[PDB]
Amino acid sequence: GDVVEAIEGAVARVADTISSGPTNSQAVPALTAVETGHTSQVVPGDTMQTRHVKNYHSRSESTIENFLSRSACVYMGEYYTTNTDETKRFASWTINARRMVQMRRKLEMFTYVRFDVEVTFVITSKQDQGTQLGQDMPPLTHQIMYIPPGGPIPKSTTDYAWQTSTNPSIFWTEGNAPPRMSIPFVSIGNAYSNFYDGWSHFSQNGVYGYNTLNNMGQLYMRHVNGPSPLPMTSIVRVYFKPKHVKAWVPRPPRLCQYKNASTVNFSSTNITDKRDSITHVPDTVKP
Amino acid sequence: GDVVEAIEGAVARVADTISSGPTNSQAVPALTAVETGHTSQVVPGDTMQTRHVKNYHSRSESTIENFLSRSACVYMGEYYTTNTDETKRFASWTINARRMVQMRRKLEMFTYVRFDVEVTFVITSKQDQGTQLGQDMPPLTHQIMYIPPGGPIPKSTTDYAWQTSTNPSIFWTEGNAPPRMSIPFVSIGNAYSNFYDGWSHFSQNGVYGYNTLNNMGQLYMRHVNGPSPLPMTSIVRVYFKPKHVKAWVPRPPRLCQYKNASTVNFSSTNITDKRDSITHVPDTVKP
Amino acid sequence: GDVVEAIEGAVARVADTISSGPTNSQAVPALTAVETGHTSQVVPGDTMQTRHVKNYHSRSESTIENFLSRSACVYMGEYYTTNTDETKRFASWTINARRMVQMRRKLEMFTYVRFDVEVTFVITSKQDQGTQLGQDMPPLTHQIMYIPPGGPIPKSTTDYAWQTSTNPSIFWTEGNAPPRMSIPFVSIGNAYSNFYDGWSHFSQNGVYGYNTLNNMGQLYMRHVNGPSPLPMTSIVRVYFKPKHVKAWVPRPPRLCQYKNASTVNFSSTNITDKRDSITHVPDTVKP
Amino acid sequence: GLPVMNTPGSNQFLTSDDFQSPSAMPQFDVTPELDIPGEVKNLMEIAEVDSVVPVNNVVGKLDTMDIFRIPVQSGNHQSTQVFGFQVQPGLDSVFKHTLLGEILNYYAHWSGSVKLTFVFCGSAMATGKFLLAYSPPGANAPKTRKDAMLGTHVIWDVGLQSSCVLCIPWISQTHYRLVHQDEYTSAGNVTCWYQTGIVVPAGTPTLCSIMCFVSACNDFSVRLLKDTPFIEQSALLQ
Amino acid sequence: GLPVMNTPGSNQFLTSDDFQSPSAMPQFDVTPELDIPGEVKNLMEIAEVDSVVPVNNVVGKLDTMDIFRIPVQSGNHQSTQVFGFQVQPGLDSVFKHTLLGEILNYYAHWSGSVKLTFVFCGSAMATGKFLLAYSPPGANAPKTRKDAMLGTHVIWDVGLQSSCVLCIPWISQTHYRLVHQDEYTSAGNVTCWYQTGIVVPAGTPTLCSIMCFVSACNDFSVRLLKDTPFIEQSALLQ
Amino acid sequence: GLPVMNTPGSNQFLTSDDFQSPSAMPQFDVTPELDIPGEVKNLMEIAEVDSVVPVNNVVGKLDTMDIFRIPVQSGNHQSTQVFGFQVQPGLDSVFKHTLLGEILNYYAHWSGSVKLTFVFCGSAMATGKFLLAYSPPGANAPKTRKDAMLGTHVIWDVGLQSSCVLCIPWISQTHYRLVHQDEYTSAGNVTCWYQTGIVVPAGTPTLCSIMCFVSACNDFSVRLLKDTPFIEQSALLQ
Amino acid sequence: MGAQVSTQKTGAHETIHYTNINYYKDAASNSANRQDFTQDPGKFTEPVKDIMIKSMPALN
Amino acid sequence: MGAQVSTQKTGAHETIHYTNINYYKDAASNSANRQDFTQDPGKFTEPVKDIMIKSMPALN
Amino acid sequence: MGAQVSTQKTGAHETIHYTNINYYKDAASNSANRQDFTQDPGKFTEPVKDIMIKSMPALN
């Protein structure tokens, strides 16, 4: 265990099919009571005769780790390299996984989650359209600064805040692998809250919901080369991959379409899609 | 220790109160010399008679981990889903914890810090105001790309840089839990520097301060659905939670108001607030 | 090993120089065949007489960890604190390390990489120029929300998506250390891909390249104080530091200049720089 | 300088990969763990829980609670089918939005048996027997109770136990079926018929309802993570 | 598919939580650790260090170094109080900006004794005795030295040891006081009086100063992390 | 409240530091590891691999494959040098863009021997001998073969083994040289001369080529990470 | 080195290990725990006192 | 499994453990070390050679 | 505490340890593995079956 430490294979199959013959008894597994809030633990061997089937299937891809540990876009932000307006040459983002809908819906399948993140950036520049497009610009380097809540916010691309003496920053020049770094679980509580039924103020007013507990800081992005002779746009895409995941209190998957990121507001949604009648099963065997 | 490994409770109480009777001696604990740069280690039992008090208080919430491991907003960035200007449809951010003031002030209480981060994003869309607001848009998915320094910066929302073959990216659709991923300690030095008394150039000029050592890259955020029929805005908030924290060389807390993120520039600030006189203690026992 | 566990020094020197005298034999180490795709393992002792040199040099700074574990800017993004347009008051970024050129080129030296990230933000505010600049604004707090793919995208700075009930967020106030959090390896595959030779659609069309596999989400950044009486700009720089790095299939370093972040498009580049002739070695010993 | 050669896949960002990264926050002290009730370790623990099936997903009822109740009544109605649907637990509009169906639409492949529990919600004085018949694929859905009773059926007798379980076993030619099911990976149909009427006394409501709960058995499993076709957006900030 | 049930608090982002996440940078080789001098492991190690108290925080002096010096002089001045303040180590404008006060304003609750060291900065030839009196709450601040000497006092004699320590003990009805202190969690007051004059020879300055240093004792502790009311901003990039 | 004192370097962001951080994704289950072929653990494993040197980097050829071939021919040409360059493996336009040169331009210091393999690419019927001469610094580049043969040389005889290795040993006054090399850390030059002609039969091409491969030996090492002067950009999104 | 040697995800019926070394100092920087397969569906199914036998009528 | 069993933050005077398993491969991805309570106020207080006794006058 | 005691990067010829404690619960949050110096240049150099002797002609 000094140089090498083995690890036993945690392999977990699904349950087998046990063989069941004919029955005539006072045992009634198909008869239960949903009124108890209890899901019936009936297997197929109770309601019909079954052969023995040795099952080798596994539930490894429905584990919470394997279900959530996928990189997913959380933000897409544009910023220019030259522009008369200065707040256009850099990008801000208040960190939250609520603006891209897929990862938000995946995370909101649980009430509480606790995990580390792997943040990857996909930065991509393009030359804006114009009368002249000929130029020779060296590779674009980008700075992504993580400003935790309370630190100084930059006002330009030449601000002192970009000195990043303590804030963590990534410098990355175009043409290389995407930048990627890890983030521990950085909540002030014992888990992140996808939902906060409550208020910010004890007077039961102010802000309602996710935003009161949600303050992880912001991300600022700029070019370091300075302005180009001709306008160029960099789009930075942010990808979160949670790892070492733990989840509590699963919720029914969001049925309605998300409206904004501040709230859970929704338009009223049908339960499902209509069919022709209650007995409608369309014929599939026909000439 | 193969299946389960116990861990002994590191519980740390504060010091007790030892009982002290009356004294008349040549020992003088209340008499010291601040000229030595030494803080007196006097307890209350030296300057008065004390009962024995068994103390059960703990300093667990002033530990550096417990003081810093809170998610804090570092960036808040807007980006549109449709706009004639292209650099508005995505957001950039140069990563640094210096633009939101609270987390910046918390981190700058130490000269050097080394930690992993947990980056959570809180993305929130809203429908812009206009003459027509009726539409049926599917859930908004967001890409947050982490571009380390040197990688290609995007120029549009359709740039090749968003291919994120190597840059880490998170795709997240609205309605789900916030995106969250971990980031290791990714400095090129042995710790992050909140303060850099020095220059970028050996000629003792160029950039002064935090920005020379601060290059962690940038974050880019975009929508993946493409443009909506009607304008919508996504705000991405970035939350950093440091974990596995180590801190060196504590500093006096920032007294003045932060001015920008590039520097430590400040307006001159009073030491404290005024009162009526040097002996002024207002009466609280009165009819 | 309960309180303290020692760790043996992994020190790795380069190979020594073995002493070689004169030779006359049928051994021919200087004669080989590059046609085999095999690099000659010749040392200097084969082609000339060598003393014994005990070498103490190490390759510790060319290790993949030590080569990549540097914070590098990946995004730089501006966002305003007050503006008539709302999508300007926050910043978005689609996470990818492809928009700043240096870190992108560093990462694209390998085909596959797997690492955790340390995301640091460097947020820096500045006061915009105008007729009146006198005001007294309290410290600027920033929210950086990480929205994994699918979560709700914000539309304003007051959106419900900023509730960050589940998305990880960092709140950081200006004046403090930069915000920094860790992110685990959050890919859905077994490693990140800097390059994806392939398509999104099985019909061999759609999107080509890095963007199909790249969805880590987005970062959103905003100010929490609300609008200032006078305009101010925060720039957030994002810095990625990969740690616990593993790399596979090294590639020839990018020779051409990066053009955008979506693609690997390039202008045709000379192999190297010209000199005067094939025998040209300029004299350095002359009066 | 150790000699080394870069392989294809270098500097690519594969969204599924699993590598170590550097932490942006070194030595960050993470909050202690709290024993919260209800920790999920596998989505199959979720899909194993009942959820009311909207079997009455006919027009004018998709936004009402009447979408959940299968109507039964007293009288000679045996010539009529109570209900019937296809066992497409992730494609059928009767199942795609149940808990099991939602979990299914995140994967491409499913396998295993599926429980349908049926609950009678009439008076304690009303009595009735039903035939619940699952028919494997390869023939059309039965048109009569005589045809339905040739498949796998349960004859449910209503009593003090108010619910019956019809377990749809895994009878497939393949180990997995597609969640986006086509005619190759078809799974059959479920129908219900009156076995022995509904008999009710006087002063009792003659028309009652039945509820359907779907859940996955213990041999159920999924494969090939994908994105749901359910949530979609047109722009960010949403 | 293991059966599983989601509990309240799922898909919420609690800013204080502590869960494992996936690393965006797998197998990232982190820089080696360096033994830097002065590692902080607890903020109480910081608050245990002296800091000059601005006791002379009267108008016209808030931006000068004269805010730190308590003025003493020679003559019959015993009818006058040298200084006095409330022991509100995180609310009082005399303490809110000291090291201890700054650390305090990040928490809601504080507990323990607080040292006030006093330093004489006159000539070596000047001599004087002072009474430093901490009075617990429940009465008004003393108006005379006769009233102040009924509380916890030290009679400081100035000599070659230039500083005295007045330890304010924890005499509270509760285990903790509020940092934002109100009349319930009041802590008393500290006053100073001339015990025996200030006597100085000729050719020596007759008016000298005293400095105050505040620090937390070893039984001091804090509770209930909060945000400071000190740093505020109007916009980003700051 | 443990007493504690903050040292310089607090709240600075040093881009090279190595500290623990909090994970933004607690308990995130990371994808399992896959044994991918070709794992790199040191960039010196990369720089130890041959790469074709562009020795013919003369005008009009920088964008063609003719930049790689050193032209040799038959006839009395011994009065002419085949080629010559400076051993500046990270500064010389002949080496800065090779694999070794690229890896070098990420560091400031290099050390060790460098292999130059030469490959003959004429007919199997063509024969020739060459002198490959590395000359240490301190004199000018040789002008004759008589001068070149006083340095470290190999007399390469072309046969069924088509390639020769000229190892440039570490002969330096310092342990390291600068990658951005100046006259102090100069490393010498490499030249080639015809030793014994090129003799070819009839019906055979009389002019052939030679290729140069550069790699780092096993004692090679680098120091002082820096940024390449190669990739540069004018703006983001690139 | 401090290598871990675990088992790769193979098949269960058809006719091997992988090595891991942690390079970074923080645990937030490791790779995902892709192979942790413990289960407990009883929190959500059968979340009742008075356990139900599945053969007994379940009422009366 | 490789479970750790530590003690929960309880009270100190009033009249229990929690389990942790690390799922991810990188240590940057673990949860915060919320319970590390070692201390050393002597770096900042009493940072002097010639230790001071607190009973002796401290000068002369 | 669970301290690790490793060796600092010193010189190799001129005439010491550092302590580490992991505070956070996730391994993604540790510090970089700055000191892992194993090597294998043979994947890229000499990636051939029929190993070459370096003394033998290497052909024929």
Residue numbers in the entry:
A (entry chain A), B (entry chain A), C (entry chain A): 1 to 287
D (entry chain C), E (entry chain C), F (entry chain C): 1 to 238
G (entry chain D), H (entry chain D), I (entry chain D): 1 to 15, 25 to 69
Give the original sentences from the paper that presented this experimental model.
Echoviruses, for which there are currently no approved vaccines or drugs, are responsible for a range of human diseases, for example echovirus 11 (E11) is a major cause of serious neonatal morbidity and mortality. Decay-accelerating factor (DAF, also known as CD55) is an attachment receptor for E11. The capsid consists of 60 identical protomers arranged with icosahedral symmetry and each protomer is composed of four capsid proteins, VP1–4, derived from the P1 polyprotein. DAF is one of the regulators of the complement system, inhibiting formation of the complement convertases in both the classical and alternative pathways.
The cryo-EM structure of the E11-DAF complex at neutral pH (pH 7.4) was determined at a nominal gold-standard resolution of 3.1 Å. In contrast the density for the DAF was weak. Whilst at low resolution the molecular envelope was clear, at high resolution the density became fragmentary at a contour level where the capsid density was still continuous. It was clear that this was in substantial part because the DAF bound close to the icosahedral 2-fold axes, so that at most only 30 DAFs could be bound per particle, in particular, SCR domains 2 and 3 of the 2-fold related DAF molecules clash. As expected for engagement with an attachment receptor with relatively weak binding (reported KD for E11 ∼3.0 μm), which is not responsible for internalisation and genome release, the E11 structure is in its un-expanded state with the natural pocket factor (modelled as sphingosine) bound in the VP1 pocket. DAF binds E11 at the southern rim of the canyon, rather than into the canyon itself. The footprint of the DAF receptor on the virus is ~900 Å2. The VP2 EF loop of E11 and SCR 3 of DAF dominate the interaction, although the VP3 BC loop of E11 and DAF SCR 4 are also involved. As a result of the differences a maximum of 30 DAF molecules can attach to E11, due to steric clashes near the 2-fold axis, whereas 60 copies of DAF can attach to the capsid in the E6 pose.
